[PDB]
Structure formats: C-alpha cells, structure tokens
Amino acid sequence: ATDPFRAAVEFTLMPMLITNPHLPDNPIVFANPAFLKLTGYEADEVMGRNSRFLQGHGTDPAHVRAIKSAIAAEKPIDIDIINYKKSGEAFWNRLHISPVHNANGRLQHFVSSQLDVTLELSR
Amino acid sequence: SQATDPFRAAVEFTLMPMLITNPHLPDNPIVFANPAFLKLTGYEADEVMGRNSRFLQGHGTDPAHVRAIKSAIAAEKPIDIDIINYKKSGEAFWNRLHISPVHNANGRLQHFVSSQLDVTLELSR
Numbered sequence A: 001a002t003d004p005f006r007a008a009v010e011f012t013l014m015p016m017l018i019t020n021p022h023l024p025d026n027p028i029v030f031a032n033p034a035f036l037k038l039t040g041y042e043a044d045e046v047m048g049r050n051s052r053f054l055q056g057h058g059t060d061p062a063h064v065r066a067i068k069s070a071i072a073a074e075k076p077i078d079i080d081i082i083n084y085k086k087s088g089e090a091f092w093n094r095l096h097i098s099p100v101h102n103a104n105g106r107l108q109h110f111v112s113s114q115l116d117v118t119l120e121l122s123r
Numbered sequence B: 001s002q003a004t005d006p007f008r009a010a011v012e013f014t015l016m017p018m019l020i021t022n023p024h025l026p027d028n029p030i031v032f033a034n035p036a037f038l039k040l041t042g043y044e045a046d047e048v049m050g051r052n053s054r055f056l057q058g059h060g061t062d063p064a065h066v067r068a069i070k071s072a073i074a075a076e077k078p079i080d081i082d083i084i085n086y087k088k089s090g091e092a093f094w095n096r097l098h099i100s101p102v103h104n105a106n107g108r109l110q111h112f113v114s115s116q117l118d119v120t121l122e123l124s125r
C-alpha cells in the first residue's frame, strides 16, 4: 500500500521541500530527489535544517523579509530570489511556498516548489 | 479529524499540473487532478475525474506520440514526451508530459502519476 501522492512528489522533476513549523526553526523534514539534484546536497545535509542555508552573499534582504513575513502570517508566497548550490554557484530560484492547515485551522506543515529560472530571467 | 497528509497538500498546492490514474479500474482513469491541472486545461474537477487522460487529445495530435505513450503504459514504464493537447476552450498547446508508474512494495503496479506543462513558447523557436 504505497501512497500515490508521496510517489508523485518523489518522481516529479520539480524540486520540492516540506518543513515542520512545530520543530524549532521550521526545519526541512523532506526534500525530493529533484531538490537534491538541483542544489547538490545529500538528504542528510538538508533534513533538520531551515531552508535559509540556500541564501548567500547576493541575496536581496527585501526578498528574505517578504518570505519571513508571509510565513509568520501563515500565508502563501511566490517570489524569485537568489540562492546558492552547495558548490557555491548562484541561481535564480522561483520559489512557491504554501502553508498546510489542519481541519481545526492549526498550522501543520509548509510545502514548497523551487525552480531554477536562471536562463529564463537571463532574457 | 485526522492530521492532514503533507504529501497530498504538496501536490494540491504546487503550481505544476499533476494527475493520478488507477490502472486497476477499466481504462486507467484519472482519480486525482490538482488545481494546477484544472487551471492549465480549463476543466472543472468533475469533468476530468473518472475519465482516461486521452480526452486532451484532438485533431492536431500526432498518432505516433499516442502510440509511444500507449506502449510505455502497457510495459509499466515511465515516459517523457511532448504532445499536442487541447484546452476546454479549444486552444491547442504543447504538453510536456512526464508519466511514472507507481509500484507496490511487492513490485505490483498500483497507480500512475504524471506532470504536465504548457511548453508552447519554448518549443516555438
């Protein structure tokens, strides 16, 4: 009895993260193979860490503030932001984050897509 | 009311169109379509649920593409392919289609899952 939705996420070519805001600092509790190929990290290097580690010297603080404020308000956000592979290579990340609420309205998870749009935006 | 499945919410909330089909029902019908798929194609959930994904094909669709998909599905193998499909509006578009079979622990086919993406502009160069 395999979960078809889990397999959807495991097999898609679109990078995806799930985080758990009931653990301290809202850490990644799942990253799909697409995310690990994109960024160069192993699963054990990203699980248990906040997604912040993708940010670096080029990252616009205005982008980071907007994400922080949407997460605190438990609201979704779409935004392009400069992020960094483990190698150190910069890329433009088209980032989509959505909160996941209980039936009772209690925040449970966050889920995200990430898409390298370096070539698109280079135009 | 149970804790909500994070992976189901991942697929419901992503902007990437996705379908799940059930090959143990007759004609391998769609049993889940995410809102991204309904935005892409223009259909309501009740117009696509319970149907084979074939309904997206039309006069422009290359039968060679359809044969290749049919043969991959019968062999329970994945396929990546661009194919002409049709929105409910009638507009034709290039669909970058990614299909994967989903196996049991025992290796028995259980579901198929797909991504779909309008790549009309990319392919138009």
Ligand SMILES: Cc1cc2nc3c(=O)[nH]c(=O)nc-3n(C[C@H](O)[C@H](O)[C@H](O)COP(=O)(O)O)c2cc1C
Binding pocket: A017, A018, A019, A026, A050, A051, A052, A054, A055, A064, A065, A067, A068, A071, A081, A083, A093, A095, A097, A110, A111, A112, A114
């Ligand atoms: C599910 C999820 C995925 C995230 N993915 C990214 C990401 O791909 N890149 C990034 O720069 N920040 C990402 N973030 C944002 C950071 O984790 C963090 O929330 C951001 O830096 C704002 O907060 P801070 O000031 O506490 O670091 C993600 C956040 C969540 C909830």
Ligand SMILES: Cc1cc2nc3c(=O)[nH]c(=O)nc-3n(C[C@H](O)[C@H](O)[C@H](O)COP(=O)(O)O)c2cc1C
Binding pocket: B019, B020, B021, B028, B052, B053, B054, B056, B057, B066, B067, B069, B070, B073, B083, B085, B095, B097, B099, B112, B113, B114, B116
């Ligand atoms: C999970 C899944 C998703 C599919 N999505 C599409 C789609 O978006 N577009 C399409 O043209 N065919 C799609 N198909 C392929 C058709 O449903 C069908 O298998 C194909 O037309 C070949 O078989 P046929 O000769 O019976 O029509 C999908 C099939 C599966 C299993």
